[PDB]
Amino acid sequence: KPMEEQSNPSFFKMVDYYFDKGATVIEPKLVEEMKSNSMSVMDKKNLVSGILKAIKPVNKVLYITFPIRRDNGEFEVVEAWRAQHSEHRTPTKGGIRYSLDVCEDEVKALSALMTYKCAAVDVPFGGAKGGVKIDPKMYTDYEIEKITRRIAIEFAKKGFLGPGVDVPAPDMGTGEREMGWIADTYAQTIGHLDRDASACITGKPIVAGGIHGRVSATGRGVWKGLEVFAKEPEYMEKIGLTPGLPGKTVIIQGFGNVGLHTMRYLHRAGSKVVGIQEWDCAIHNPAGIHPKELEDWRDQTGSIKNFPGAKNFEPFGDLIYEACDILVPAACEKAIHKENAGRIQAKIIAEAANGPTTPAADKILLERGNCLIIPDMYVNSGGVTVSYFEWLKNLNHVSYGRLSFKYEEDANLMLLQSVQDSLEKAIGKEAPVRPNAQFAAKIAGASEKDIVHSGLEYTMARSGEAIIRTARKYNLGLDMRTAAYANSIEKVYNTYRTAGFTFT
Amino acid sequence: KPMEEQSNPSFFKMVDYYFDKGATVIEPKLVEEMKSNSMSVMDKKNLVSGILKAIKPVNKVLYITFPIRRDNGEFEVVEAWRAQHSEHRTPTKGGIRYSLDVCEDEVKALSALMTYKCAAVDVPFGGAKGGVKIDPKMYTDYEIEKITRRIAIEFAKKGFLGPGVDVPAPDMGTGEREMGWIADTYAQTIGHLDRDASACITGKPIVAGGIHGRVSATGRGVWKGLEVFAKEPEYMEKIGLTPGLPGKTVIIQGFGNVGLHTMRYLHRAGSKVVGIQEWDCAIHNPAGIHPKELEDWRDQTGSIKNFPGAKNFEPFGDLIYEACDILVPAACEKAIHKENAGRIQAKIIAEAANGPTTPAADKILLERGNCLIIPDMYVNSGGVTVSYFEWLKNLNHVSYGRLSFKYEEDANLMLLQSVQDSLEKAIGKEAPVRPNAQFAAKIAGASEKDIVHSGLEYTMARSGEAIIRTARKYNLGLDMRTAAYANSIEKVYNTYRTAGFTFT
Amino acid sequence: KPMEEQSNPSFFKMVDYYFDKGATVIEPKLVEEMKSNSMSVMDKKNLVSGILKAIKPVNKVLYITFPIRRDNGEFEVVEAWRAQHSEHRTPTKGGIRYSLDVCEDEVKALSALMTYKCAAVDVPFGGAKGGVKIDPKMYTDYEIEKITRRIAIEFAKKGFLGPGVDVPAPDMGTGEREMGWIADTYAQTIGHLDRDASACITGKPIVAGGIHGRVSATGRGVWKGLEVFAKEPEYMEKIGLTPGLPGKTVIIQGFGNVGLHTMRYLHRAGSKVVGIQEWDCAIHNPAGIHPKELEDWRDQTGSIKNFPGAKNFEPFGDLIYEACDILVPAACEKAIHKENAGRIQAKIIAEAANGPTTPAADKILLERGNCLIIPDMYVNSGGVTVSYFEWLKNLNHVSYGRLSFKYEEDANLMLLQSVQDSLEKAIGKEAPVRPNAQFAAKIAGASEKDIVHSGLEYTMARSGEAIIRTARKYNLGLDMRTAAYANSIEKVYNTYRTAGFTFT
Structure with missing residues (x-):
């Protein structure tokens, strides 16, 4: 059919x-x-x-098995997979699932989709996807941590984890604390001489570079x-x-x-x-x-x-x-x-x-x-x-805005003060020129997330307009x-x- | 007691x-x-x-001895120490003293203080401190230079000098010219393949990346x-x-x-x-x-x-x-x-x-x-x-402001010209809108140090306010x-x- | 004489x-x-x-010979040269000629000139120059490509190509497509672990990092x-x-x-x-x-x-x-x-x-x-x-302006809106404050080339003024x-x- x-x-x-x-x-x-x-x-x-x-x-798939020690002392074998769909730009990019539904076919298909989504928002990464075949609810925090550190080492030994080769992210069944663990494991082992170790993964807690x-x-x-x-x-x-x-x-x-x-x-x-x-x-x-x-x-x-x-x-x-x-x-x-x-x-x-x-x-x-x-x-x-x-x-x-928030705020106040001086000279009375209610609120809460928000809004408008132009042209x-x-x-x-x- | x-x-x-x-x-x-x-x-x-x-x-202390050739031809043995108090963030950071009072206990205590000072101003480095046990006034410039290049090599061989591991600075008895010598020694020897060699030390002369x-x-x-x-x-x-x-x-x-x-x-x-x-x-x-x-x-x-x-x-x-x-x-x-x-x-x-x-x-x-x-x-x-x-x-x-001083200056002049055009349309006479005396002086002397000054002022206000908030809360x-x-x-x-x- | x-x-x-x-x-x-x-x-x-x-x-010259296979099946030997005049700053910088006039003396003289031109525009590179002794019109695109990939490998094995050591550029008889080929050859071979491979050469096509x-x-x-x-x-x-x-x-x-x-x-x-x-x-x-x-x-x-x-x-x-x-x-x-x-x-x-x-x-x-x-x-x-x-x-x-065009545009509109609110309060009528015709055109066409243009104009004015000041002083x-x-x-x-x- x-x-x-x-x-x-x-x-x-x-x-x-x-x-x-x-x-x-x-x-x-x-x-x-x-x-x-x-x-x-x-x-x-x-x-x-x-x-x-x-x-x-898909260009590459790595499949691994490895033992882990349960908390009571018996051992279990765990399967995992990491697919890199396209290497036309490196590193590749994509999340890691902990779920009983992970399999080779699923990490393959979503890694392909991920190459096209990166291109859609002008992000210079090929697509990747990964997964560990477990039900994360059946494990203690100690066991989750041992599984997480082991996939970091094994993936990183073969070029499926690292800031220049492959950069993962959270997905169903994982979150920011697993991401912190992977970043710490990489920095202390395979990545111990890498000046940019904390860039091996995204979704990290703020304190660790999120x-x-x-x-x-x-x-x-x-x-x-x-x-x-x-x-x-x-x-x-x-x-x-x-x-x-x-x-x-x-x-x-x-x-x-x-x-x-x-x-x-x-x-x-x-x-x-x-x-x-x-x-x-x-x-x-x-x-x-x-x-x-x-x-x-x-x-x-x-x-x-x-x-x-x-x-x-x-x-x-x-x-x-x-x-x-x-x-x-x-x-x-x-x-x-x-x-x-x-x-x-x-x-x-x-x-x-x-x-x-x-x-x-x-x-x-x-x-x-x-x-x-x-x-x-x-x-x-x-x-x-x-x-x-x-x-x-x-x-x-360095975090975005660390070397510019005060410099740009002071330039803006000198700008408004220059306007106030020229206005008062021209109309011959006192005439305050201050930020209005909306501008004063932005100036006062200026932080990294505002740069991030504007970056995202810029990209979505540009890519959305390019889709429309292509749809009209054909x-x-x-x-x-x-x-x-x-x-x-x-x-x-x-x-x-x-x-x-x-x-x- | x-x-x-x-x-x-x-x-x-x-x-x-x-x-x-x-x-x-x-x-x-x-x-x-x-x-x-x-x-x-x-x-x-x-x-x-x-x-x-x-x-x-303190996590780590490295102690070294090494010979130097005096100018007249006899040889002397020199002691030095480098302490890394905390590696929770790398590289570690701290100065180097040339003084007859340097000893293990002193580089230990000031390296601890340095971890807490870095955290206080939100600077992502663990604390370090170093010292060479000499009276720098008793030596010629040629002898100081030989001592300085030797501590660079020996520290850098063991991971106590380098842009990703440990980044020193001037202190009592050292200054910017010793820092230039250390940066040059590192770049030509242990750091000869390091793309960021000049980042191994701070306090350098301007021409060398200060x-x-x-x-x-x-x-x-x-x-x-x-x-x-x-x-x-x-x-x-x-x-x-x-x-x-x-x-x-x-x-x-x-x-x-x-x-x-x-x-x-x-x-x-x-x-x-x-x-x-x-x-x-x-x-x-x-x-x-x-x-x-x-x-x-x-x-x-x-x-x-x-x-x-x-x-x-x-x-x-x-x-x-x-x-x-x-x-x-x-x-x-x-x-x-x-x-x-x-x-x-x-x-x-x-x-x-x-x-x-x-x-x-x-x-x-x-x-x-x-x-x-x-x-x-x-x-x-x-x-x-x-x-x-x-x-x-x-x-x-690249130096701060190299790709933004003229771009931002021209945007500000187009901004003031847009205000002047709208003001004149509104009040129906000629009405110049120019930078005032203070703004024209900043625009004319704009340079890297102004970005540095604003960065520092931003950090001290934020950290000072956080100290006050914590003191009131408890x-x-x-x-x-x-x-x-x-x-x-x-x-x-x-x-x-x-x-x-x-x-x- | x-x-x-x-x-x-x-x-x-x-x-x-x-x-x-x-x-x-x-x-x-x-x-x-x-x-x-x-x-x-x-x-x-x-x-x-x-x-x-x-x-x-000149500090260094590398001379090489190597065979290539013509399209019909016979083989030819090709000569090339790369000169590094000064290593006082690394990487060195300079173009590559494909021309029957290339010789050791010519790459030497122009590499010297290039050290002084880099210093003249405050660009932190020593001077380099290179050349391949061929008439590029006598070769097919397939043969040009084989010659280009081979000079990449041989130069890069000896430290005459790479982002931290020597960074070439187009010249007579070469253009952006040869530059893309060199960057791709370096990234897949000698530079396969280099996080900054695309920085090994300039003049690249936009899609490849130009x-x-x-x-x-x-x-x-x-x-x-x-x-x-x-x-x-x-x-x-x-x-x-x-x-x-x-x-x-x-x-x-x-x-x-x-x-x-x-x-x-x-x-x-x-x-x-x-x-x-x-x-x-x-x-x-x-x-x-x-x-x-x-x-x-x-x-x-x-x-x-x-x-x-x-x-x-x-x-x-x-x-x-x-x-x-x-x-x-x-x-x-x-x-x-x-x-x-x-x-x-x-x-x-x-x-x-x-x-x-x-x-x-x-x-x-x-x-x-x-x-x-x-x-x-x-x-x-x-x-x-x-x-x-x-x-x-x-x-x-990342490209210049990707994380700032929308953030700065929105600050400028809030600035003009704050001026409009204060003007209307002061003169008691409606009074639009908008970007004028020139400012609206810049805002609407804002792109990387405008940052590049302003950077260049800034450097030429500063260096031109320093030449004048020196000529008057002596x-x-x-x-x-x-x-x-x-x-x-x-x-x-x-x-x-x-x-x-x-x-x-």
Whole structure:
């Protein structure tokens, strides 16, 4: 069965089908970019197709087994995997899962997706992904620590951990304290002469070189991606909406890190979050749900169920089919497939999760003509941008703003004082020129996270605009996914084009 | 005899007694910061006390002997020492003395103090200290050079010199030309493949990678530390003073680098420096002494004695007991002890020297209730901040401001021109909008030292405010030393907490 | 025959004669800068003369031969050379020529010139130069690629290629695609563990780490060098000219990269380019030639001959003797010699080429009293400044402005909004305060090249002013070349002075 008609396809097959759509569009452009007076047009097309043939498969996978000592004294053997999809830029970049679902095929497929997401936000890393096949809840903190230090050593001995070769990150089942342990193990062993050891991994605690602004970054990028598309009347009218985020109604599938922080930013932006659907229960409220109260309730009772500021909802798994302006898939992959795509009524889908829409569903919804999907490899890449800033920070050996906050603040005050002196000379009375309420608040709370926030907002706007320009140039309509892959493929291809692919 | 009643205690014992006072205050906070669902409160308190037990002793000392050839042809054996107190962050940092008083115990005690001073100004280095046991005046420039190159090689072979491991600095009996020699020896030998060789040491001549603004930096930090405390009415009233530095009278013990530059900044700030006490003579003048004339006189005659702009003073060693608002100990250690603390009449003591106040004297003066001591590990750490900027500069391989002075100047002129255009449109006449006299002077003299000055001022204000907040939170009164150690201990402890102390 | 009377002297002899003139002027200053209480004035003068004796000769030359396989299957032996003139700062810096005229003597002489040009624009590299003895037009792209990868490996094995040791650049017969190949070969072989591999060479394609603003940089520096001298009335009056570039007539010898970009900047500055003289034809027009049309015509027909916007000129090789305010030699070396210096009527000569004026001609024109030569080692060093920025960029691992364009733009808008609020409060009506037309255009097109442009303009003004100050201090008149060598010698000497030259 062709991919556009399958029901539960493999994740790696989805990535490659979407890759092919983008490659077909951008191929003539790639041929034109190959400047060579020695090659005919036929020769150029054969080399371009060779380059694309090398990009799609994963370059490298390392598989390891190793014993650990349980706390009571018996020993167990643990499996782990680390995939490096592309080395066209080094180091490679990607997270590490502790989960019973990790396997070779899964670290392969998500490492491919990660190469394209790095290219999408102009982050100079090839894609990587890793995993340890354990249920982290069945282990004590002491056992988790021994497992974590051992994967650091074994990965680093073979070139799958280090600031210049491969730089990991947190994922499901790991967090910042595991990242601190890996950084400490690397610095004391394999990396003991490395001047930049703390740059071997990102997601670290602040005290160990982590960066302010990381926790909310993926959510802040989902908000900024919607804002780039909500300001465009040509697209908002085709789908039956008015410009802007204030007033729009939002249903969110998932209340993890990504769902909760996206709710905070969309609420602050003036949107109405009318529905939260979880794995065992759903809630709703057509007037909107207040983020701080909902998070507080779940924090105390253990669930979003019976939230006083909303009502529980009928067969909880069907909330995502209700009418809304924006649906945010923020849970598991393939949550939208062939058998339920038609039941979707949202006008905008913002993929805050890895591949939540299969190619069959993506096609059913493109044919319906009234639904704009903002692709995952762009819109949930905010955290990838800020992990690039954390690596930079560890290479700079100083926090952002340490040598500029006071210098720039004093220049700004001398600027306003110069304006005040000239104004008073001109109108001949006293006339204070001070920072207004908003400017005084920024000046007073100036910190590293503001530089990080501005860096992320800059990248998402630039990349979002480039997707739109590509979609208009090739008459792609509302198919922004194909436009995003074409921009991503084009960047990777140009590395191979200038590095030299003549050898083989 | 308990430490609060001894008369001449060892310097290392003073540092550890002050360490214990701070540790006692902050210990409950450290327990609360240990997030672990696996440990009971009892377990956390036992691990916290283990961490503090490892922080206090010096981790490493290297001792060396080596021959040198005198100029006439005979040979002599020279001793030297280098201590690394803490490696919780690398490289370690600290100066090198050429003096007949260097010994193992002295490089040990001052290396401990140096760990806490680095933490106090948020500088990411463990503490180190070094020394060569010679009287530098008895040697020719050729012999000093041979000794200096030899300690470079021997220290660097064992990991006690290098940009990522241990970064020295000038001290008594050494200066910038010895630092240039060490940097050149390292780059041509042990460090011949090191891309960042010039970052192995700080205090270098400008042409070799030194930084503008280093000479006056420790004095500029003493001034900024007094200014943080002089603006606080709650404390100025408890000691019988009015806010601010203009008008306050100042007596300074010592006319070396630190005393002279502190006099320059305090005079420029509007204070009256009524007394200078040296090792063999003192002078005074209740109207104030002009810094540039005094420095000129000593430069020509060889001493501050018989300065025309002041009178010589009765038993010169007793000037520091005269009434004043501010006393600045800037000479030897333990200048204030049990037998002379009561004779001190100053309301503020700004410790511009390493441990000038013993624990007995510190306690006699805390009980008198009317005397505010600003602790040495904070207030004479301005030079430590700027040595961190010099290391950064050598890692960046470019001077600060090289790629921004003209870009930012042109943006500021386009900003003022935009304001001028809008003002003239609004009021309908010609109305120049130019930088005022102060802003035009800064724009015209913009240079690396202005970035350095602002960086230092930023750090001293932030750290000074954090000392005050900690002193108010734990009801410490005027005991700012204990508050400063508690902030310093807390930073070091959090490195150990996240790095992992489970092994042992 | 003395150098000031020779007719066709060797290029290395010209550089050393000019070196001696500068050394003679600055020698007393160098003696005074040697602070040492151990040496007499006689001793200092002997050591200074030793240092200058070591600076002039080339420190190192590497010569290599190697086989290559032609495309048809036969083999050929190729020669190449790489000279490192000075290692007082590392890495060394300089381009690589593919040309049948490369030889040991030529890479030696231009490597010496390159040390002095780096010092002239405050760029911290010793001088290097390289070459491959081939006619690049006789080879296919495949053969050029094999030659290029082989010189990368062989140079890098011996320390003549690498980010910390020696950093090359394009020159006659090479361009950005060869630079990409060298960077890729180094990163995959000798440099496979080097975290900063892409910094081994400059002139790279953008996608591989090249820098925006490189193509026009040497021309932009010729324009800025003329502007520094055209604003000075003392000199413009001695040569019979009025201040400024608007209105001045310009004849340019050469229409390569340097000549064409200089024409663009001088035209945009308001100058009239009345003549272009090439190797086989010349054109002229006393009303001026439009750059974009001329470049278009040559692009289509293959030559500047029969340009519709001008007339062809009588014995084409004599256009450079016609009256003009500014002559720009931008072709081959020694284009002005003893037998044709008198025929030169230009009031300003801006040497946009390596040594276009021999010492005999330089002296004939200094005696005529009415001709100001702006020396090549200063005025055609704009590209050297920007190659330093490209190396910095590869060490920073991020493009300039990536983490500041949006942060600074938002601060500027909050600044203007604060001014608007205060203005409206003061005059009691609505009064917009917006960026004017020029400021809005800069804000909207803000990019890396603007930082690069400002960096270059800053350096050329500072170095141009230092040449003028030195020429006035030693009564050098219009002899700016001697003043420029003296500033360059002084910088190199101070490295040797502080590094230590006592050994030998």
